[PDB]
Paper text:
The 20S proteasome core particle (CP) is the key non-lysosomal protease of eukaryotic cells. Its seven different α and seven different β subunits assemble into four heptameric rings that are stacked on each other to form a hollow cylinder. Only three out of the seven different β subunits, namely β1, β2 and β5, bear N-terminal proteolytic active centres, and before CP maturation these are protected by propeptides. In the last stage of CP biogenesis, the prosegments are autocatalytically removed through nucleophilic attack by the active site residue Thr1 on the preceding peptide bond involving Gly(-1)45.
Yeast strains carrying the single mutations β1-[name] or β2-[name], or both, are viable, even though one or two of the three distinct catalytic β subunits are disabled and carry remnants of their N-terminal propeptides. Regarding the β2 propeptide, Thr(-2) occupies the S1 pocket but is less deeply anchored compared with Leu(-2) in β1, which might be due to the rather large β2-S1 pocket created by Gly45. Thr(-2) positions Gly(-1)O via hydrogen bonding (∼2.8 Å) in a perfect trajectory for the nucleophilic attack by Thr1Oγ. As proven by the β2-[name] crystal structures, Thr(-2) hydrogen bonds to Gly(-1)O. Although this interaction was not observed for the β5-H(-2)T-[name] mutant, exchange of Thr(-2) by Val in β2, a conservative mutation regarding size but drastic with respect to polarity, was found to inhibit maturation of this subunit.
Author numbering:
A (entry chain a): 1 to 233
B (entry chain I): 1 to 204
C (entry chain Y): 1 to 212
D (entry chain J), I (entry chain X): 1 to 195
E (entry chain N), J (entry chain b): 1 to 196
F (entry chain Q): 1 to 125
G (entry chain H): -5 to 222
H (entry chain Z): 1 to 222
The structure:
C-alpha cells in the first residue's frame, strides 16, 4: 500500500487474422481532475511488441524504464539481438508477470493493469493480461478497467471465440477498436477524446498511430431532452 | 449470531405429473448443540402446504399467524384458500415487516382444487416470490439442495417416482450440512390424497 | 471434532470422529484424525488440520533421529516436549493445535500428554478435545475404570465418540479406534456412525428419544 | 443465572436448578430458588440476565393466577407454555428484551401425562423428555441420551439427575453451589429437601 | 457538475453541463440541469440529484400556489422558498442551488444557495465541482451589463474550461435565457466548445 | 573474524596441532580412573612443587558435571574449565528438554564432539 | 439476505411508441435461484415497469403505485399517465431515503404520448430515448451507444433492445437465460412477448437419474388428513 | 488498503477409478461479475503421470503449479531420473503450501494419477497444506453443489436395495472411465445451470498407465 | 492458573496452590502441581498464562540448578528472588512477555530465617509475611491481617491457611479443586498430603 | 500555496506566493518557496515543508557532486534526481515539486513532479492548493514564446487570482527569472497585484 495517484484508464485490445491491435487514451487523471493530457500509455518494445498500461502513472514510468533496460540487457554479448535472439512478446510478458507477482507478494504492488500485445517469431498472435495482483489470463479480446465492462462486449461480437480470429480482418478489427474507444469516451468520466492505437501484424510489422481522436459522435438528440420528468419547456 | 443459521434446517419442494412434493429435515439446534429431532417445518392450511426454514421462534410464530389468517379467510370466503392466493398472503405478510423482518425462508406447495394445476413457490425473508416450475429450496443447506435438485430433477415425474427424487435430494444435501438432518419427512400431495413419509437417515 | 484418549490397565485407547467442516458445510466425512507418528506413538488432530498433520509428522522425524543418536526408544515425555517446545516458539503467530501425544514405554508405562498451541503440556489419564468434547467426557467419566478390559475400553472409546457425534453438529462421519501397547499401537477399524448408531441403539437400548 | 435441568419420567416432571447467585467477584447467595409455581400442577424454572429473570417469572405467575381465578380452571401445561412462548417472542423484538430462558414442568390432569417444555429467550419452544439451558446440556445430554427411558420411575429419574449433577460438578469450572430439585406430578408440586 | 447564472443588460442567463456520474460511470451524458420553477424563474442544481429534484418540485408547487393567490412571485421570493427548505433541512440535504429569474421591475437577478442554506445575491454565480477551476477565469472576465451575445460567450467559455478539467462535468452545454422577450433555450455541442 | 586454519594435515597425514595438544596432556599431572563392580574411583596426582597452596579454594582436579557424573582431566588447566562449563550447561539443557539426566556416554560424546570441532574450525587451536 | 438479482434491463424509444426488455435470471449471491423469472411488470394496461436491485422492493413498489394508479384512473375517469407513476414512485422512494432499494425503468403510452424514464432508489429520475439498468447495464449501454439512432422503427427497436439484453446475458454473470420484451405502441394494445428469445436451452443430460423404486430407506408411512 | 488476494472463481473435480483417475475443471476465469476468459486452462499435466489443479486465486494457483513442476524437474536431477510417485508428490506439495503458512496460497489444490500399485489416486489439499487421499473431490465455487450428488451417485449414499427397505445397502460396484466421465459432465452441466461462475467449457484430463489424455466439452456461456 | 497463596511463619514458609487446570469449557485436570523446586531449600509456585507458566518455572529451575553445580553452593532465597525478578523485568519489555506471577518460599540456612517473596509478571518484587496473586488476596488478606502472628508455628499457619481456603471455596465463583500445600523449612521441602 | 513555472522565449520564470499556514494560522507570511538547487536550476515547493526542504537539500548536494565530476547538469538530470527521491520514497513523502532550469543547449525547461513521483515535461506548470482556481485562466492565457514582460504579467495575474480565492495562499508574489543573462529575483507586493 498505499494508493494509486495519477492514473490512466482503460486499455483495450483484440486479435485478428494476421496479428493484434491495442489502444489506450492519452489522459493522466488526478482523481476527478483531468490533469495531464499528453500521456502515452502504449509502450513499444522492439518491432514485435506493444505493452499497454493502465493504473498508477508513476509505476507505469517505472515499468517503462524496466522494459528499456530489458532491451539494453538483451543486446549485451548477443550477436543475434536483432534476429533469432531478439525479445519476444512472450519473454516480455513473463518478465512483467514475474515482477508484478513478486511485488504483490512483498505487499508493495505496482498498481497497474497491463496488456502485452505482439506477434511471436513463428507468426503467432500474442495477447495476455497481468495486473497488480499478478493475475494473468489470455482471451481473443482483452480490456482493463472500464474497457472490461464496455469494450469487451463490443469486441466479443466480432471475435466471440478462437475460430473467429482467422475470419477477422485488420480493417474490421480496427473499426471495432475505434468504436469501442468512442463508447468509452461517452460513458467513462475519466477518459479523454485523444488516444493512441498500435497494430502489430506478422506481415506489415508494427504500426504505431498517435494523436487519434474520437469522431462521428452523436449529441444532436440532446436538444429535445428537457427536465427530469414533467417539465415541457 | 446470524439469525437464519442459529437453529438450522432445510425445506425442498418439487412438482410432478398431477402432483407436488414438499419435504423437510427434523433438526432443531442451538448452533452446535442438537436440541430436537422432532421439529417439523411443514404445516398445512386446508390443502395448501407451507414449509418454513430459518429462526425457529419465527417458524412457530408464522405458522400460528397463517393458521389465524386462513381460518378467518375460510369463515368469510366460505371456501379453503388456494395455493396461488396463499402465496400472495405470505408475501404481503412478510413485507409488512420490511424493516423488522421474520428471519425465515418459507416454501409453499399445493394443487389448485379447481384447475388441478400443481403449484410451488418460495420466498426470501422479506416477501419476494420465487415461482419456479421445477423446484424450490430453502435453509442452511440450500446450496447443496440446488446441486442435488438440478441434477436429479426431471419434469412430469409420477408421484412414487417424485418421492424417490425429492427424498434423495433432501437426504444427500442434509448429510453435507452440519445444521441439518436428524430425521426427515416427505409429503406426496395429489388432488384428493396426501401421503406423509418419515425417512431413515444417519443421526449425526 | 471429537477426539479422546485415556490410560487404562491394558495401555491407551485412542478414539476420534472423522468429520471436517468449513462453517456449516461438511468438507469431509473421511478425515484421519489419528496421526501415526511412528509404530509406537500416536497423536490426535484438533484445531488446525495442517498444523497437527505437519508438526506431528515432523515430530516423527525428530523421534527417529533421537533413537538413531541415542540407540534407545524416545520417551513419551521427551517426544511430547519436543512438540510443545516447538509450538511455544511460534506462540502468537496463530498456530491452532489441541493434541494428545500417546505412547507406552518401559520406564513410563502408558502415558498421555495433552499438548496445545498456547504452549500447554499436561500429563493425564483422560483427555477429550474438540467441539464435542463435553459429550464424550460424560460417557467417559461415568464408565471409566482403570481395570477395564481391552475389549470394554475399546467399546467405551467408541461409545463416547458416538455420544458426541449424535449431539455435536460438527462431529460424526465415522469412528477410528486405536489401542496402544508397549510393543506398538494396534488399529481397531473404521466404524461408520450411521450404521453404528442404529446398532448401538438396538443392542444397548439407549437413545430412546430417537425413533428407529 | 446458571444451570437449570429438566427430566420428564413416567408419571412426573423433575426440575433441578442451581442455588448460586454470583455478582461478578463474589457469590452473594447459595440458597436461591430459581423457580415459580404458575399453577398447582405447573412449575417454571428460569435462568438469564439479573433482574429480568425474576421480573419475567413473577409477571407470568401473576397472569396464570389471574386466568385461574377468572375461569375457575387450571390451564393445561401446553396452554401455559404457549402463553409463555408468545410473551418471549413478543419480547425479543421489544425496546429491551427479556433475557430469560425457562423450563416449564407440568402435569396435565386431563391427559394424565407429565410434560416438559423448553423455551429460550427468543421464544423457541420444544417439548422434550429432558432438557436444559446454557452449557448444562453439553455436560449432561450424553448421560441422558444413554440412560433415559420413557417408563422410568421418579426415583430412577432422581438417580439419573444425580449422575448429571456429579458430571457438572466435576467438569464445570464454576461452583454453582448444588441444586434445588422439585417434582411435579398428579398431586402437585413438592421439593426434594435432601439432594 | 458545472453550473452558473449570469445577469446581463436584458436579464439573466443560466448555464450548465449535462454530465451525471455514479463514481466514474457516466449514468446520464445528456442531463438537463436547468429546471423551471416558474415561467421566468429557473434554477441550476448541484449536489444530490434526488434532493435537488425534490426541493425544486416543492418550490414549483409553492410558487404555483403563490401565483394563484398573490400573482407573479419575485425572484427574491423564489430564492427565499428555496432557502427555507435548504436551511431548515440542512442535516438531511446535500443541495447547492443557483436561483435565477427575470422581473420587469427588478430585471435579471441571481441568488446562490450553498450547502449550509445561506442566501447570497450576486451579479453572477458559479457552482458544482467544476466551478473550482474557473474562479480565476470568471473573476477576470465578468463585466456588468454585458450584451446577450457576450454573456453567452462568457458562459460558453467558462463552462468549456470547467468541463475540460473536471471529470464530473461534460457532455453538452445547455443554457436558458431569461428576458422581457421570453424564454429561450440554447444548446452547444462538444465539437463547438472544445475548440474554443 | 580471525579465520586462520591452525589445525591442518602434513605430508605424512598428521595434524601436528592435535598431536602437540597431546604433548600438553603428557605434561599434565597424572589422572587415573578405575571402575569396580558397583563404583568408579577417580584418582588424581597433585605435584608438590607448589606448597604454601590454599587447598580449600584451589581448583580441585575432579569436577561434578551433574549430581551423578564427574570429570577429571590431564593437560592445560585453563582449557579444562571451558570444557567443564560447556558440559555442565549441556547437562542442564538435556534435563530441561528430555526430562532425564544425561547418560555418561552422552555427556562423553558431547565433550568429545566439542574437542573434535576445535580440530577443524578456523581461528582456534 | 433479501433477494437482489442480477439483471439486464433496457428501454428504447421508437417511431410510434416505446419498448422495454429484460433478461430472465434471478440470483441469490453466486447461485441462480430462478432461471426464468419475469422482470417486466405492469403498472397499468399500457404502462410497464422493468425492475432491478432489491427484488422485493421493486415488486412491492411497482404494485403499490399500480394500485394507487388504478384508483386514480377510476376517480378521474381518465387513462393513467406515465408522469403520474413517475411522480408517485419518486416521492415514495425519496421519503425512505434509499432504504427501499428499487431501481426502475418506467415506460408506457398515454393520451399525452409515449414516455421513457428511469428511477433511482434515492428518488432521482432521468429522461432518455435509450436507458439501461442492472448489473449488465454497462454491457447493454455499450451496445445501445454503438447501434442506437434517431427515428427507429418498431422492428429495429425490438432488435436493438434484445441485442442490448444479449450483451448482458453473455458478458455479465448477474444476467442470463432468456430475453423478455414488451412493446407499447400508440393507438394499439401493449404486447407482452414472454421469452421472446431462448438462446440458453439446457442440453440433454448424459444419463437419467431415475432411481429404482425402494431405493430410499423409510421408517414410517401415514395417510394425512386434508379434508374436514 | 491493498488486498493481496482475489477470487478467480472456477470449479474442479477429481475422481479416482480402479485403474485410472480423472481431474476435470471448467475453463472460465472471472473477477466479480465479469468474464476474463472463456478458455483459461486450469488443470495441468505436471509430468511423471501426475495432473494438478490449484483452484481459487489464480495468481497463487499458477505460482504453486509452477513451483511443483519445478520440483519434479529437480527431483529428477537430484535422484537419478527417478519417477516421482503420487504419494511423494502429495507430501512435497504439503511442504510447498505450509512454507507459506502465515501468508498462504489462497487455493484449493487437487492432484490425480496412479499409485505405485497402478490404482487410481486423488489427493486433496487445503490452502495451508493439510492433505488426504480421496476417492472423490470437487473443489472451488460449485463444490457444495457437486459433492452431495457424488456422494449419492458414486458412493451410493442413502441408496438401498429395493424390497429390503433400508436393510441392505446398494453395493459399491466399480465404475468405468466412460461412466465416470458421464458423472463429471452431468456434474458440470448442473453446476453451470445453478452457479454463475461456472460455464463456457469443461476440460478433463484422464490418467492411465498409458499416460495422460485430454477431453474437452462445451458448457453454456451465459 | 488460578489461586496461589503463601505464608511465612516462625520457622517455615508454606505455599498453597490450586489443583485445577481449566481450558475454557472443561476442567482437564484436578491434581496439577503448580510449583517447582529451585534448590533444596527454595520452592517457587506460579500462576499466569498457559504454557508460559511451566516454561518460565522450568527455565528458572534449570538456571539455579546450574549455579548450584558450578559453585557447589545453594544461593540464598534473596539471591534467587532477585535473579527471578530480573528475568521478569527483562521479559516485560520483550517481543512476547512471560505472563507469569510467582511466589518464592525459601529457608535461608545462613540467617536461619524463612523468607517469602511475591513477584508479579512485571518484575514487581516484595518480601512479605504472607502473599497471593490474582483475586486470592481479595478474599484472604482480611483473615490474614487479623490472625497472623510472626511467632506462629507451622501447624497454626496451616490452620490459618485452611480458614483462607474455606473462605475462597465459599465466595469464589470458580471451582479450583482444592489446593496442594507444601512446607519449606531448615530440613528442606515437603508436601502436606492431606488437606 | 500557489506555485508555477513558465517557459518563454529567453528561458523560464518561476513564480510563487509567500504564505505558509498551520491550519488557519499564517506561520510565515514572507516565505521563500523558490529554492536554488543549482546556479540555473531552481524549484518551486508544495506539500510538506519538512519533506520538500529535505528533498531539495539532497538534490542540491547531488548536483554539486555531479558538477565537480561531470560539469553542469541538465535540467532533465535535476528533474530525474528529484523524481528518484520522490518516487522511491512515495510512501513517506508529501511533496509536489516543479523543477525549472536554463541550459544554453536546451534553453528554458519545466518539469512537474506530482505526489506519486511521476515526471511530466511541460511548457508551463501550476501546482499547490491555489492552482485549482487558475486552471481555466492559465489554459486560456498561456502562449508559447512569450517575452519576459508578458511572462511576468502572466504569472503575476495568475498567482493574483490563486491568492484571491485560496486562503492557504497570500503575501508577496516572488519570482525568479532564468536566462542566458543570469538570475534575476523579482518581488511584487499586495498593493500592486490585488488591483489587477
Ligand atoms: Mg447433516
Ligand atoms: Mg453431529
Ligand atoms: Mg470533462
Ligand atoms: Mg453459468
Amino acid at each position: 500500500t498505499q494508493q494509486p495517484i495519477v492514473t490512466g484508464t482503460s486499455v483495450i485490445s483484440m486479435k485478428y487474422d494476421n496479428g493484434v491491435i491495442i489502444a489506450a487514451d492519452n489522459l493522466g487523471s488526478y482523481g476527478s481532475l483531468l490533469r495531464f493530457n499528453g500521456v502515452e500509455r502504449l509502450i513499444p518494445v522492439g518491432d514485435n511488441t506493444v505493452v499497454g498500461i493502465s493504473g498508477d502513472i508513476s509505476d507505469m514510468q517505472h515499468i517503462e524504464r524496466l522494459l528499456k533496460d530489458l532491451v539494453t540487457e538483451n543486446a549485451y554479448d548477443n550477436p543475434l539481438a536483432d534476429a533469432e535472439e531478439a525479445l519476444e512478446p512472450s519473454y516480455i510478458f513473463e518478465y512483467l508477470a514475474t515482477v508484478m507477482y513478486q511485488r504483490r507478494s512483498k505487499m508493495n504492488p505496482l498498481w497497474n493493469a497491463i496488456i502485452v500485445a505482439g506477434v511471436q517469431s513463428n507468426g503467432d498472435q500474442f495477447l495476455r493480461y497481468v495486473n497488480l495482483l499478478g493475475v494473468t489470463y489470455s482471451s481473443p479480446t482483452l480490456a482493463t478497467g472500464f474497457g472490461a465492462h464496455m469494450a469487451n462486449p463490443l469486441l466479443r461480437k466480432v471475435v466471440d471465440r478462437e475460430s473467429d480470429i482467422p475470419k477477422t480482418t485488420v480493417q474490421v478489427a480496427e473499426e471495432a477498436i475505434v468504436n469501442a474507444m468512442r463508447v468509452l469516451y461517452y460513458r467513462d468520466a475519466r477518459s479523454s477524446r485523444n488516444f493512441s492505437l498500435a497494430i502489430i501484424d506478422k506481415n506489415t510489422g508494427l504500426t504505431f498511430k498517435k494523436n487519434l481522436q474520437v469522431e462521428n459522435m452523436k449529441w444532436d438528440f440532446a436538444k429535445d431532452i428537457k427536465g427530469y420528468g414533467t417539465q415541457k419547456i | 449470531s446470524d439469525p437464519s443459521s442459529i437453529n438450522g434446517g432445510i425445506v425442498v419442494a418439487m412438482t410432478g405429473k398431477d402432483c407436488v412434493a414438499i419435504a423437510c429435515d427434523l433438526r432443531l439446534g442451538s448452533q452446535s448443540l442438537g436440541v430436537s429431532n422432532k421439529f417439523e417445518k411443514i404445516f398445512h392450511y386446508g390443502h395448501v402446504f407451507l414449509g418454513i426454514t430459518g429462526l425457529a421462534t419465527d417458524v412457530t410464530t408464522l405458522n400460528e399467524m397463517f393458521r389465524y389468517k386462513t381460518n378467518l379467510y375460510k369463515l368469510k370466503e366460505e371456501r379453503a384458500i388456494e395455493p396461488e392466493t396463499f402465496t400472495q398472503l405470505v408475501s404481503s405478510s412478510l413485507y409488512e415487516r420490511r424493516f423488522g423482518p421474520y428471519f425465515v425462508g418459507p416454501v409453499v406447495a399445493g394443487i389448485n382444487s379447481k384447475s388441478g394445476k400443481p403449484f410451488i413457490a418460495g420466498f426470501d425473508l422479506i416477501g419476494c416470490i420465487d415461482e419456479a416450475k421445477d423446484f424450490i429450496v430453502s435453509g442452511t443447506a440450500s446450496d447443496q439442495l440446488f446441486g442435488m435438485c438440478e441434477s436429479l430433477y426431471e419434469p412430469n415425474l409420477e408421484p412414487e417416482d417424485l418421492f424417490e427424487t425429492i427424498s434423495q435430494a433432501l437426504l444427500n444435501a442434509a448429510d453435507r450440512d452440519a445444521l441439518s438432518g436428524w430425521g426427515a419427512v416427505v409429503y406426496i400431495i395429489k388432488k384428493d390424497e396426501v401421503v406423509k413419509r418419515y425417512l431413515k437417515m444417519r443421526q449425526d | 471434532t471429537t477426539t479422546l484418549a485415556f490410560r487404562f490397565q491394558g495401555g491407551i485407547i485412542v478414539a476420534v470422529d472423522s468429520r471436517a467442516t468449513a462453517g456449516n458445510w461438511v468438507a469431509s466425512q473421511t478425515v484421519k484424525k489419528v496421526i501415526e507418528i511412528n509404530p509406537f506413538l500416536l497423536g490426535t488432530m484438533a484445531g488446525g488440520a495442517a498444523d497437527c498433520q505437519f508438526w506431528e509428522t515432523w515430530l516423527g522425524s525428530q523421534c527417529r533421529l533421537h533413537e538413531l543418536r541415542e540407540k534407545e526408544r524416545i520417551s513419551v515425555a521427551a517426544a511430547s516436549k519436543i512438540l510443545s517446545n516447538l509450538v511455544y516458539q511460534y506462540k502468537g503467530a496463530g498456530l491452532s493445535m489441541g493434541t494428545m501425544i500417546c505412547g507406552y514405554t518401559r520406564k513410563e508405562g502408558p502415558t498421555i500428554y495433552y499438548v496445545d498451541s498456547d504452549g500447554t503440556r499436561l500429563k493425564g489419564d483422560i483427555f477429550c478435545v474438540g467441539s464435542g468434547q463435553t459429550f464424550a467426557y460424560g460417557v467417559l467419566d461415568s464408565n471409566y475404570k482403570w481395570d477395564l478390559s481391552v475389549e470394554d475400553a475399546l467399546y467405551l472409546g467408541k461409545r463416547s465418540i458416538l455420544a458426541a457425534a449424535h449431539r455435536d453438529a460438527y462431529s460424526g462421519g465415522s469412528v477410528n479406534l486405536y489401542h496402544v501397547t508397549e510393543d506398538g499401537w494396534i488399529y481397531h477399524g473404521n466404524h461408520d456412525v450411521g450404521e453404528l448408531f442404529w446398532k448401538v441403539k438396538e443392542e444397548e437400548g439407549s437413545f430412546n428419544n430417537v425413533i428407529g | 443465572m446458571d444451570i437449570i435441568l429438566g427430566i420428564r419420567v413416567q408419571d412426573s416432571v423433575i426440575l433441578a436448578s442451581s442455588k448460586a447467585v454470583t455478582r461478578g467477584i463474589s457469590v452473594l447467595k447459595d440458597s436461591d430458588d430459581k423457580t415459580r409455581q404458575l399453577s398447582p400442577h405447573t412449575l417454571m424454572s428460569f435462568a438469564g440476565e439479573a433482574g429480568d429473570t425474576v421480573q419475567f417469572a413473577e409477571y407470568i405467575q401473576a397472569n396464570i393466577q389471574l386466568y385461574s381465578i377468572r375461569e375457575d380452571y387450571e390451564l393445561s401445561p401446553q396452554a401455559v407454555s404457549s402463553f409463555v412462548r408468545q410473551e418471549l417472542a413478543k419480547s425479543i423484538r421489544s425496546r429491551r428484551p427479556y433475557q430469560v430462558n425457562v423450563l416449564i414442568g407440568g402435569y396435565d390432569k386431563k391427559k394424565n401425562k407429565p410434560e416438559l417444555y423448553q423455551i429460550d429467550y427468543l421464544g423457541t419452544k420444544v417439548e422434550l423428555p429432558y432438557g436444559a439451558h446454557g452449557y448444562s446440556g453439553f455436560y449432561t445430554f450424553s448421560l441422558l441420551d444413554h440412560h433415559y427411558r420413557p417408563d422410568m420411575t421418579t426415583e430412577e429419574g432422581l438417580d439419573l439427575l444425580k449422575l448429571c449433577v456429579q458430571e457438572l460438578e466435576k467438569r464445570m469450572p464454576m461452583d454453582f453451589k448444588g441444586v434445588i430439585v422439585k417434582i411435579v406430578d398428579k398431586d402437585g408440586i413438592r421439593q426434594v429437601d435432601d439432594f | 457538475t458545472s453550473i452558473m447564472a449570469v445577469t446581463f443588460k436584458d436579464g439573466v442567463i443560466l448555464g450548465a453541463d449535462s454530465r451525471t456520474t455514479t463514481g466514474a460511470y457516466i449514468a446520464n451524458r445528456v442531463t438537463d440541469k436547468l429546471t423551471r420553477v416558474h415561467d421566468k424563474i429557473w434554477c441550476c442544481r448541484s449536489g444530490s440529484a434526488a434532493d435537488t429534484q425534490a426541493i425544486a418540485d416543492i418550490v414549483q408547487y409553492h410558487l404555483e400556489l403563490y401565483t394563484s393567490q398573490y400573482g407573479t412571485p419575485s425572484t427574491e421570493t423564489a430564492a427565499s422558498v428555496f432557502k427555507e427548505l435548504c436551511y431548515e433541512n440542512k442535516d438531511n440535504l446535500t443541495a447547492g442551488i443557483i436561483v435565477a429569474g427575470y422581473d420587469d421591475k427588478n430585471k435579471g437577478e441571481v441568488y446562490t444557495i450553498p450547502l449550509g442554506g445561506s442566501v447570497h445575491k450576486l451579479p453572477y454565480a458559479i457552482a458544482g465541482s467544476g466551478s473550482t477551476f474557473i474562479y480565476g477565469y470568471c473573476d477576470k472576465n465578468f463585466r456588468e451589463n454585458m450584451s446577450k451575445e457576450e454573456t453567452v460567450d462568457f458562459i460558453k467559455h467558462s463552462l468549456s474550461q470547467a468541463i475540460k478539467w473536471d471529470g464530473s462535468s461534460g457532455g453538452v452545454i445547455r443554457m436558458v435565457v431569461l428576458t422581457a422577450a421570453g424564454v429561450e433555450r440554447l444548446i452547444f455541442y462538444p465539437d463547438e466548445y472544445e475548440q474554443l | 573474524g580471525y579465520d586462520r586454519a591452525l589445525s591442518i594435515f602434513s605430508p605424512d597425514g598428521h595434524i601436528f596441532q592435535v598431536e602437540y595438544a597431546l604433548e600438553a596432556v603428557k605434561r599434565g599431572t597424572c589422572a587415573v580412573g578405575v571402575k569396580g563392580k558397583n563404583c568408579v574411583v577417580l584418582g588424581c596426582e597433585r605435584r608438590s612443587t607448589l606448597k604454601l597452596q590454599d587447598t580449600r579454594i584451589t581448583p580441585s582436579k575432579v569436577s561434578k558435571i551433574d549430581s551423578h557424573v564427574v570429570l577429571s582431566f590431564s593437560g592445560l588447566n585453563a582449557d579444562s574449565r571451558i570444557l567443564i562449563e560447556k558440559a555442565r550447561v549441556e547437562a542442564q539443557s538435556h534435563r530441561l528438554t528430555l526430562e532425564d539426566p544425561v547418560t555418561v556416554e552422552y555427556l562423553t560424546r558431547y565433550v568429545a564432539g566439542v574437542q573434535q570441532r576445535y580440530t577443524q574450525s578456523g581461528g582456534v587451536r | 439476505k433479501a433477494t437482489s438479482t442480477g439483471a439486464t434491463i433496457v428501454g428504447v424509444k421508437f417511431n410510434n411508441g416505446v419498448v422495454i426488455a429484460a433478461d430472465t435470471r434471478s440470483t441469490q449471491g453466486p447461485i441462480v435461484a430462478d432461471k426464468n423469472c419475469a422482470k417486466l411488470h405492469r403498472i397499468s394496461p399500457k404502462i410497464w415497469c422493468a425492475g432491478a436491485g432489491t427484488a422485493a422492493d421493486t415488486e412491492a413498489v411497482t404494485q403499490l403505485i399500480g394500485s394507487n394508479i388504478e384508483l386514480h384512473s377510476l376517480y378521474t375517469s381518465r387513462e393513467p399517465r406515465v408522469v403520474s407513476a413517475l411522480q408517485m414512485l419518486k416521492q415514495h422512494l425519496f421519503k425512505y431515503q434509499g432504504h427501499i432499494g428499487a431501481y426502475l425503468i418506467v415506460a408506457g403510452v398515454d393520451p399525452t404520448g409515449s414516455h421513457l424514464f428511469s428511477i433511482h432508489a434515492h428518488g432521482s429520475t432521468d429522461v432518455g430515448y435509450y436507458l439501461s439498468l442492472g448489473s449488465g447495464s454497462l454491457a447493454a449501454m455499450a451496445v445501445l451507444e454503438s447501434h442506437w439512432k434517431q427515428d427507429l422503427t418498431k422492428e429495429e427497436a425490438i432488435k436493438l433492445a434484445s441485442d442490448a439484453i444479449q450483451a448482458g446475458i453473455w458478458n455479465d454473470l448477474g444476467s442470463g437465460s432468456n430475453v423478455d420484451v414488451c412493446v407499447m405502441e400508440i393507438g394499439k394494445d401493449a404486447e407482452y412477448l414472454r421469452n421472446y428469445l431462448t438462446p440458453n436451452v439446457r442440453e440433454e443430460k448424459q444419463k437419467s437419474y431415475k432411481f429404482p423404486r425402494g431405493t430410499t430407506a423409510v421408517l414410517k408411512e401415514s395417510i394425512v388428513n386434508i379434508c374436514d | 488498503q491493498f488486498n493481496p488476494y482475489g477470487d478467480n472463481g472456477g470449479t474442479i473435480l477429481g475422481i479416482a477409478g480402479e485403474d485410472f483417475a480423472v481431474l476435470a475443471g471448467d475453463t472460465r476465469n472471472i473477477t466479480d461479475y465479469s468474464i476474463n476468459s472463456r478458455y483459461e486452462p486450469k488443470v495441468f499435466d505436471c509430468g511423471d503421470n501426475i495432473v494438478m489443479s490449484a483452484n481459487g486465486f489464480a495468481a497463487d494457483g499458477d505460482a504453486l503449479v509452477k513451483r511443483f513442476k519445478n520440483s519434479v524437474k529437480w527431483y529428477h536431477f537430484d535422484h537419478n531420473d527417478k519417477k516421482l510417485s503420487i504419494n511423494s508428490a502429495a507430501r512435497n506439495i504439503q511442504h510447498l503450501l505450509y512454507g507459506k503458512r502465515f501468508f498462504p496460497y489462497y487455493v484449493h489444490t487437487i492432484i490425480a494419477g496412479l499409485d505405485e500399485d497402478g490404482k487410481g489416486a486423488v489427493y486433496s489439499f487445503d490452502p495451508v497444506g493439510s492433505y488426504e487421499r480421496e476417492q472423490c473431490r470437487a473443489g472451488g465455487a460449485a463444490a457444495s453443489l457437486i459433492m452431495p450428488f457424488l456422494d449419492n451417485q458414486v458412493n451410493f449414499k442413502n441408496q438401498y436395495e429395493p424390497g429390503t427397505n433400508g436393510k441392505v445397502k446398494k453395493p459399491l460396484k466399480y465404475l468405468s472411465v466412460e461412466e465416470v466421465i458421464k458423472l463429471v459432465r452431468d456434474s458440470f452441466t448442473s453446476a453451470t445451470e445453478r452457479h454463475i461462475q461456472v460455464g463456457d467449457g469443461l476440460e478433463i484430463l484422464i490418467v492411465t498407465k498409458d499416460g495422460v489424455r485430454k477431453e474437452f466439452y462445451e458448457l453454456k456461456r451465459d
